């Protein structure tokens, strides 16, 4: 059962720099002492990532409220978190995030992972209530307040926890890249202890694969699940929750890039180059080497990627008379076959299979999938 929190009030965005972070292993082939070029969805180097504290204390009175915004999922996301008290517990992925469409649940309690794909009726503010026991205090019992109801479950997965026990300046950087390609949700992660660096650290850590989930759902938006150590019925004046949100999480969006990954002798990706970043990296990607010599080098294009697409078709309104062609009361014989010209209309075959089933449909010189986004000069049936 869900609990209503306060209005988020739409805090203004804040950005920070991700110095060469988010690189994952693209394949499962051991590569040693080689420079491999892969074109895939990577976080661009030195990008602006959106940073949100888990608990923000911004009011004049001193209100503490979770910053749990629902954020978009554009072709993948890099979620980095710097916390010290396990206040971040997981995520939810979906399009509408209600009972109409399927959604993905990832939640981490003290013992294992719960991964479920159901039709969850998520409330506006999903969180886990966390209370320590009276005598032990070694683990934290969790009360799940994420969804009102769950139906039509088609997936279930449990394993060892994604987030390790963090039970005092020992912050940790946990990083995960989430991708939804061809019906599999792929998760890639690395855990590194950090020290005295408030923001994302400068350095290179490669994200090893974690799991490939055959969820087979459509994902457009995501939210972050947080742990509520304080009480919603009585908010403390201060110190009831975790230190006014020193803990924080970072969100970056993947984009199609070409990376030159350098695998070392032990098989590890030790360095990468973003070919689209500066001209030196374009020269490095053209020469397939991390060291270039003195001189002038002609470089191939890696710098520009199209972001928008335009479609321009003639001003045609009426639908093609496929009812006359296909649903005629009598057809011609094969020795005198009937040829009909089709012109000045829109060729929509999606109205055909409402009631007509075609045993044979073979297209020569054109693919049937590319038949929608094409214009024909003359058509003869």
């Amino acid at each position, epitope marked *: 059962q869900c609990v209503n*929190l306060t209005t988020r009030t739409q805090l203004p965005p804040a950005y920070t720099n991700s110095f060469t972070r988010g690189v994952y292993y693209p394949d499962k082939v051991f590569r040693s002492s080689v420079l491999h070029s892969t074109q895939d969805l990577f976080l661009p180097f030195f990008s602006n990532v959106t940073w949100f504290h888990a608990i923000h204390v911004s009011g004049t009175n001193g209100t503490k409220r979770f910053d749990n915004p629902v954020l978009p999922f554009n072709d993948g996301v890099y979620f980095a978190s710097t916390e010290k008290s396990n206040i971040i517990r997981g995520w939810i992925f979906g399009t509408t995030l209600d009972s109409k469409t399927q959604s993905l649940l990832i939640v981490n309690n003290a013992t294992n992972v719960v991964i479920k794909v159901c039709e969850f009726q998520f409330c506006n503010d999903p969180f886990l209530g966390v209370y320590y026991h*009276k005598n032990n205090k070694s683990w934290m019992e969790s*009360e799940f307040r994420v969804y009102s109801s769950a139906n039509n479950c088609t997936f279930e997965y449990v394993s060892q926890p994604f987030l390790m026990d963090l039970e005092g300046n020992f912050k940790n950087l946990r990083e995960f890249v989430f991708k939804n390609i061809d019906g599999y949700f792929k998760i890639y992660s690395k855990h590194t202890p950090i020290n005295l660096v408030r923001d994302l650290p400068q350095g290179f850590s490669a994200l090893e694969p974690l799991v490939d989930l055959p969820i087979g759902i459509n994902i457009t938006r995501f939210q972050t699940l947080l742990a509520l150590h*304080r*009480s*919603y019925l*009585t908010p403390g004046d201060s110190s*009831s929750g975790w230190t006014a949100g020193a803990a924080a999480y970072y969100v970056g969006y993947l984009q199609p890039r070409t990376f030159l990954l350098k695998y070392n002798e032990n098989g590890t990706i030790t360095d990468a180059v973003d070919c689209a970043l500066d001209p030196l990296s374009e020269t490095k990607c053209t020469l397939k080497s991390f060291t270039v010599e003195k001189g002038i080098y002609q470089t191939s294009n890696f710098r520009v990627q199209p972001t928008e697409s335009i479609v321009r078709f003639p001003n045609i309104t009426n639908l093609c008379p496929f009812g006359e062609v296909f649903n005629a009361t009598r057809f011609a014989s094969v020795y005198a076959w009937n040829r009909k010209r089709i012109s000045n209309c829109v060729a929509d075959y999606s109205v055909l299979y409402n009631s007509a089933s075609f045993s044979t449909f073979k297209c020569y010189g054109v693919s049937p999938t590319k038949l929608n986004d094409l214009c024909f000069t003359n058509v003869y049936a």
Partner: antibody
Framework: QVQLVESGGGVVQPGRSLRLSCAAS????????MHWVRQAPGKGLEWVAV????????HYADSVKGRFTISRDNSKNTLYLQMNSLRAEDTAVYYC???????????????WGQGTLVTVSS | SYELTQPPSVSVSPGQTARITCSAD??????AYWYQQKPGQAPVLVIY???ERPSGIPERFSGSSSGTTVTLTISGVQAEDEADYYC?????????????FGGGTKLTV
């Protein structure tokens, strides 16, 4: 002297609505949650209702779920227990108490109002 | 859901100790609280978190827990302590939090 004085309690026939008004003084009323606890004559205490600090959340005992409604006015620092469709078992000395814990799993009632006697007359 | 088991009554002579114990299966894993309801007066908090005494309560009152059982003992039974004593624990078992009380003890000086 975080003081909670209630009023608005009296005899009633079953199946009639009665509204209890618990006032507050001497403390930040909006910063603290509040409860209602009834004590039947000759019997022990029993919790009935919850209201959040803001008033954004409220739960009721399974015996009196939905039959009462609870609300607070943060401007007038007054607590309200609007009761409808009273039955014979509802006779008690209703107490307005204040939630006293800042941690999620556990809570208690440090201050308590003097009490209003709600009597049902068959 | 779970019910706290509290004795109906105790009889203690003055100038002695008076231990009030109530036990439940969840009391070993959750805190318990003690209130005193003098006849004709509202209940007042006496011991909270199984050991902690708020200010304004005399030093006689002390509390401790022993696994399943939690206890409330009085270091000297004055006549002013003749009242009703209750337990409280919070059941998080249901969809929403619940507050369970005890039967109460009739302490006679």
């Amino acid at each position: 002297q975080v003081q909670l004085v209630e009023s608005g309690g009296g005899v009633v026939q079953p199946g009639r609505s009665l509204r209890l008004s618990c006032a507050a003084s001497g403390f930040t009323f909006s910063s603290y949650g509040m409860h209602w606890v009834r004590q039947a004559p000759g019997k022990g205490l029993e919790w009935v209702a919850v209201i959040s600090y803001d008033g954004s959340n409220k739960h009721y005992a399974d015996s009196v779920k939905g039959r009462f409604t609870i609300s607070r006015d943060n401007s007038k620092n007054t607590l309200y227990l609007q009761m409808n469709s009273l039955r014979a078992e509802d006779t008690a000395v209703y107490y307005c108490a204040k939630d006293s814990g800042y941690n999620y799993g556990y809570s208690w009632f440090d201050p308590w109002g003097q009490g209003t006697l709600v009597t049902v007359s068959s | 859901s779970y019910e706290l088991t509290q004795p109906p009554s105790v009889s203690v002579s003055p100038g002695q100790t008076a231990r009030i114990t109530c036990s439940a299966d969840a009391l070993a894993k959750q805190y318990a609280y003690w209130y005193q309801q003098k006849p004709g007066q509202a209940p007042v908090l006496v011991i909270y978190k199984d050991s902690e005494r708020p200010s304004g309560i005399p030093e006689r009152f002390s509390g401790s827990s022993s696994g399943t059982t939690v206890t409330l003992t009085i270091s000297g039974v004055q006549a002013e302590d003749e009242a009703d004593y209750y337990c409280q624990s919070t059941d998080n078992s249901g969809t929403y939090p619940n507050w369970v009380f005890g039967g109460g003890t009739k302490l006679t000086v």
